[PDB]
Design a protein around this ligand. Structure first.
Ligand SMILES: COc1cc(NC(=O)C[C@@]2(C)C[C@H](c3cccc(Cl)c3)[C@@H](c3ccc(Cl)c(F)c3)N([C@H](CS(=O)(=O)C(C)(C)C)C3CC3)C2=O)ccc1C(=O)O
Length: 105
């Protein structure tokens, strides 16, 4: 990972320009972002990933760091993504699940 600002996280697995994609989260995704301090309705993807990461850690969905698995089956995030769990290493898979929950500007 890289952290180009205090509210963004990027990855070499995804093109840099893709992480600058402007998006308008649908209501559930937006709710999760605002629960950890987000104050707007439009974001770059790298900001969405930052806030989703904060949400995951705040809800204690990634306690076992070395296992690299988020367990979200009983959380809003599991409903958002439509999976019971996923790997924090699989960044394209994560981007794909997020894209289903937003409109691209
Ligand atoms: C790809 O290979 C690896 C990946 C990893 N780990 C990751 O890629 C996970 C990552 C470091 C980036 C990992 C990340 C970062 C940028 C983009 C993407 Cl798609 C993923 C990122 C993350 C953020 C949001 C979501 Cl929804 C998610 F599932 C995972 N998170 C966040 C923490 S954070 O990076 O935001 C930090 C607080 C440390 C700045 C954790 C809470 C979910 C990570 O911890 C570890 C080891 C290896 C290896 O084999 O060497």
């Amino acid at each position: 990972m890289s952290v180009p600002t205090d509210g963004a996280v990027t990855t070499s697995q995804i093109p840099a320009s893709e992480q600058e994609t402007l998006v308008r989260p649908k209501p559930l995704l937006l709710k999760l972002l605002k629960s950890v301090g987000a104050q707007k309705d439009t974001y770059t993807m790298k900001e969405v990933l930052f806030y989703l990461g904060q949400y995951i850690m705040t809800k204690r969905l990634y306690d076992e760091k070395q296992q690299h698995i988020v367990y979200c089956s009983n959380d809003l995030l599991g409903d958002l993504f439509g999976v019971p769990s996923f790997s924090v290493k699989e960044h394209r898979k994560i981007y794909t699940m997020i894209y289903r929950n937003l409109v691209v500007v």
